[model samples]
Target: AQNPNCNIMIFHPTKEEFNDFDKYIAYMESQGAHRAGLAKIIPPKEWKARETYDNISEILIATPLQQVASGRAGVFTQYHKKKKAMTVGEYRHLANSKKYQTPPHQNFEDLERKYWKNRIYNSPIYGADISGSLFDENTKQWNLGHLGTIQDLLEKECGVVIEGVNTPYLYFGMWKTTFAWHTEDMDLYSINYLHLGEPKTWYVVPPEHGQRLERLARELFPGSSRGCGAFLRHKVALISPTVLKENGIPFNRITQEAGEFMVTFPYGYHAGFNHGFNCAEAINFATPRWIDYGKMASQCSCGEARVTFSMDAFVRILQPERYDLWKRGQD
Candidate 1:
């Protein structure tokens, strides 16, 4: 059963609306879409669909074993050594095979129980850069790199290419392949578009509930939190929405199908699993207003205190005249 309160807003934007990214986003935010921390966008019917599948060939597989044995609230899975290489054609064949078609669990408990004693070969292709890929060079409107707001701000203004952030990354997923709970790198906004195949089920918590979620994370994984103030950055934890609701945290769920876009707000925590074989492209972006969020998330407290990118440098380059005013206000 679907919870009404947990449903995220889905927008059906026209060609004109979809083309102007900033304006459309401002309108979406005006409708209070940001409160849910995520929104789904359906492109115009006339939009040109890309043939990324035909263009892509070999890809690195990420084998993340489910951590059901831990009997914990999160999915702290281990990665395999010696990256496995496989062609997209071969991976697609295996993903669609009968052995991988495990029945859906009625609930998270049932899902956990099954995985505790049993293992399914879950191979997902993540962080595959598509800078010079044929699809990247061919597509314009929906291409992550050419998207207006992110490109205009980060690339045209800053003039630096941050792979998987400014540049696009392609993801290939199969049944139950999960991306653990985490915010985008440096807490920047992220936009993901499903090019083809089955839907992805997403669970997201609003920025207001971010601290509460972190508190719960600390309680669930004390050692990890003790080791690093920003342990969620590790992207290893996966708490079910059931647990989140029980702990009095607000959450929303959305099913992102092919040709739809999922946009996450700055500092919004999200995690999701694929329904079946699918291809999606994603990239991080920042607007002028994101400067404050960027400043607050500049560095981690310990373990990894490195900053992803210098907000100061970006602002100085993006808006030289306003930089001094912004600096003075901070003082």
Candidate 2:
């Protein structure tokens, strides 16, 4: 049964309707889909697939596994601090084996406990920059790096390419492998497309509750939070949806399958794990309105070290032209 309290809006758009990224996102935002922090887009079946698993399989990569037998999520802990390197093909072989499915512990304290721990190393390929790879070129409609609005603002106005932010990064995942709770770098909007493979589940807290979630995180993990106000940027914090709901925090859950796109709004806190082996590509984009959020994010001293791209430099270059347009009262 679907949890009535947690509702993630799912959109089924025809290929034609989905062709224009800005138009559909604007329409969805108007419908209050942004209130859910994240939304899923299921493209029309008629659309042809781009890129293949075989192409990604031969690429050598390194990934780390969460070593704890507990459901607590995080990366680089004492249990397994070092990442193991292998080809995607080799990782897939190990992930699909029956031994990989067994849990470290048979008895469960709660249903939430069953979701995170695994006996096998759940090594997921994280942020493998594929811009130089054959998979970089995508159809205009699904080309996340060059989104019409973002390209005009960041590329055209700023005149630079911020790798991973404006370029594509490929990710490979297996059962129980996870991305911890956190917002996008500089709180920018992000789009993730599951090229092909098993479903990836996501949990998101609305933008309005972004601070509240941060406060909760600080309380839950005092040591880390005390060290840095933006400790969550470490991507080493995890809180189950059950724990959030019990704490009276509002959140939404969605299971994203292949051919679907997941869009995360600015300042939205999201985290999730894969149900099985999967390959996905993600990139961040910023709208003109993102200037305000980017400014606020840049102000967080704790996140200075983690800033992927300099928002200050971007604003410095963009402000003059925007000021010129404003002086002439041009929209």
Candidate 3:
């Protein structure tokens, strides 16, 4: 259901003014993210568009697919609620292949469009957000450590800021590519800017009713096994926004157009589809206020926690600085 209180926001095709930019970034951090609403940012010509993404496969050839396993190179079948996983290369082949092009309905063009309307087939090659190329993942190292001393300086000065999590990635999608209902790690915030291509449709569930939505999800998608890894990747049946609101669950919808930015708040359950062929880049980040949430997410049972962030590394960086701040307060 759609509620004005829990609505996803939209901004018009504005330019690259710092005031507007800073205003929305703060608005999202303060209200939008915590509310779990999708915030669409339609900024002007500051970032590149479709041409920049057209040759993505070659750029992502050496990257690790597991980095974005949540939605990478997976096919969400419309005929059945299932996902087929494959490599980044394989996804590239199939998406551009003629074999899967024909529709499985009475008519070729119309039926295919109909099927695309309701299902998802997407190829995502992630972890290229920083260098726009393959990065070293050995020893579970920080992906952005290449920044050398600058990384430490930013950490110390910015506290828990945007670059802390370092999970920026790219998406290559066709009609019907879908990501299921889920929250950002430890209820963290995310900003997904559509570099170029057709718009993406999003449905978001507010954080207040997140646990309730989880309960309903489990009941609806109760797989044969419990909390198994398989259940984590299994797609949930489509729960329309109308049905969601009717059940007293709050949600809102927004079509994130080309050159727009969609930001998600901590623990906002969001799912979406691409209108046609499209490419987008997304990244995850934590704020100064999200320390406790990160701690809890680190302790949670989910698999993403153990590797999401170096809790010890963060504490080491912050303790020294905060200690001095505490000492100053005592003086």
Please give the CA lDDT of all the candidate structures: 0.65, 0.65, 0.49
Q: Show where candidate 3 strays beyond 4 Å.
A: 1-4, 12-16, 19-23, 28-36, 45-57, 61-167, 223-225, 228-246, 298-331
TM-score of 3: 0.61
lDDT of 1 by residue, 40-85 (tens): 9888887755654665546544432332223343434434233455
Sort all candidates by TM-score, best to worst: 2, 1, 3
Candidate 3 lDDT tens digits, 220-283: 5455125533232233335555446666776777677776667787667787665545566665
Q: Over the stretch 134-252, how does candidate 2's per-residue lDDT look in tens digits?
A: 23455556665455545456665456654322566777677666777878866888888887777788989988778888888888877777877677766767787667877887887
Clashing pairs in 3: 1-244, 1-245, 33-265, 119-176, 120-176, 120-177
Candidate with better TM-score, 1 vs 2: 2
Model 1: residues with Cα > 4 Å off, grouped in runs: 1-7, 58-70, 73-82, 102-139, 148-165, 301-331
TM-score for all predictions? 0.76, 0.77, 0.61
- Cα deviation in Å at residue 232, candidate 1? 0.2
Question: Quick one: best TM-score, which candidate?
Answer: 2
